[PDB]
Design a protein around this ligand. Sequence first.
Ligand SMILES: Cc1cc2nc3c(=O)[nH]c(=O)nc-3n(C[C@H](O)[C@H](O)[C@H](O)COP(=O)(O)O)c2cc1C
Ligand code: SF4
Ligand code: FES
Ligand code: NA
Ligand code: NA
Lengths: 418, 156
Amino acid sequence: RSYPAIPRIYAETTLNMLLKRAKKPRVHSIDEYLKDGGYQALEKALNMSPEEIIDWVDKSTLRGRGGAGFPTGKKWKFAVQNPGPRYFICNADESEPGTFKDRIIIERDPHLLIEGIIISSYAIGANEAYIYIRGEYPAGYYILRDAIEEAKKKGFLGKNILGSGFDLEIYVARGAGAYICGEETALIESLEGKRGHPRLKPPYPVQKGLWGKPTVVNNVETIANVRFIISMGWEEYRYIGPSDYAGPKLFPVSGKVKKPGVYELPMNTTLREVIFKYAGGTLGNKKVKAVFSGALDCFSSEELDIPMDYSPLGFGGTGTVIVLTEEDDIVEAALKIAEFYEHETCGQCTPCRVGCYEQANLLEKIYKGEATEQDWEGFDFVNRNIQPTSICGLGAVAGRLIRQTLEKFPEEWEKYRK
Amino acid sequence: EFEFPEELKTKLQEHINYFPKKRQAILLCLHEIQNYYGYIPPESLKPLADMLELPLNHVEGVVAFYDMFDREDKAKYRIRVCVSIVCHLMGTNKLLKALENILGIKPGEVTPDGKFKIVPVQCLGACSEAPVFMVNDDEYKFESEVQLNEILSRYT
Ligand SMILES: Cc1cc2nc3c(=O)[nH]c(=O)nc-3n(C[C@H](O)[C@H](O)[C@H](O)COP(=O)(O)O)c2cc1C
Ligand code: SF4
Ligand code: FES
Ligand code: NA
Ligand code: NA
């Protein structure tokens, strides 16, 4: 059938793994996927014990691609120490500013994700899996529903999959406008038909998740690696990139670069290389002023030689790269980040609820030149006091990037105060 | 007193039958209702509540929480315009200006004929194609007023 219009995001790979098909901006259906050896990793996995699959995924060094970088195998191992039934959830909520890596897998190579979900589900003994996709990805939703039907018709889903005795259904759920539903516990609340309110952790979902049962939540990109780990083996997988932070990584690059798009690169690539070697440099060859790591971190032009890995001095996050150049007003950009958090706090925790609102309200006053001295002092205070009593990561980071701009670009902020 | 047309009721029932538990279908149902009416009618929620086997209060709370749903304005076509950092950098304001030039409305407004509503939204996850907008489910990069005018002419 036809799907809603999608802009054709540029995609480029040096590894030819996650973007082997998704480098071309169109839906690759099951016959095309099968041609390339699609679903053969699944067939292999079904001839392995769950324990063995968990072991390979552990030894691969795969880490969560949804922002927290938790080791995937270890997560699975934790889930299976708890009595079943268990649930598997694919997190396709991708709503962080700058971040558009997951959609190109969903929309162009859905079977890569589906194959990974089935293997992952088998590994943890889940017979019921979910994809939670943000509501603003309607094409991805319809594409996934159709791909799941294709997989059923070829016997990769349903009961007694390929004679293995393993049963699996994959349900596709849709979000409805809340960034917070990407937080794994709020996602589960939404799957249970409620508001997206994060739960106090611990317990972690792997102990008590959907309907209080052991639940593994993994990001789309994380899951898209599973086929490769089974296909190649963990040893060969670990030979991709540097041996500590191994494997392909997707980098959604936007803002003031000549070639904005998604880049599949190893994690020893530097930030400078991402911008200048791969993304074609800056618009107008203007000087880089800052890189926003989505809405999380702000790196200065003195920090471009860092690796795009999960190391302490590395870029980290989700590899989201928003490039600002010399003429971009840092305070204007900070206001946009404040506005995001204002719009997305769920309001459960008081300092988060009040702090996200006040941070944006006062920063807007500052930007417009209408801030009193008290407003300035209040802004500083609030920025530093969003995190207390927070039960999820949003409250913990709502002031982080903005504080970094205050520290790294004092001269520009001072201009607004004077 | 208010009742779903049978064709819509059929589709709501499909959603409710899709997940293991009925209440899991609440967002799919609300999307379906909004698609059908051009908004969420307040009167729709009690009947929906009954089908989901949920208290009305629960359904109301969910509609209020989730930003895609609109109980106030009917519109045939929602023009969702990204106002987050990357689109702002790359020209949200030019898109909005072009929209006002073509349609005569600003964010939050509906045209008098009820045809178009401009809806400011957070990052749509297409930042490389900034500035981004949607027309209902279709999504586009804004290039210019001439280009936008041609896109919008496809929605009648
Ligand atoms: C406010 C907030 C929003 C989040 N949004 C996403 C998201 O859109 N997608 C995602 O996979 N993880 C998101 N996460 C992280 C998830 O809670 C979780 O760590 C992740 O889905 C686990 O999968 P992974 O181990 O494969 O990364 C978010 C976390 C927070 C605190
Ligand atoms: S920290 Fe903020 S977003 Fe997270 S649960 Fe508390 S109020 Fe909600
Ligand atoms: S900032 Fe507009 S699509 Fe991401
Ligand atoms: Na072996
Ligand atoms: Na969402």
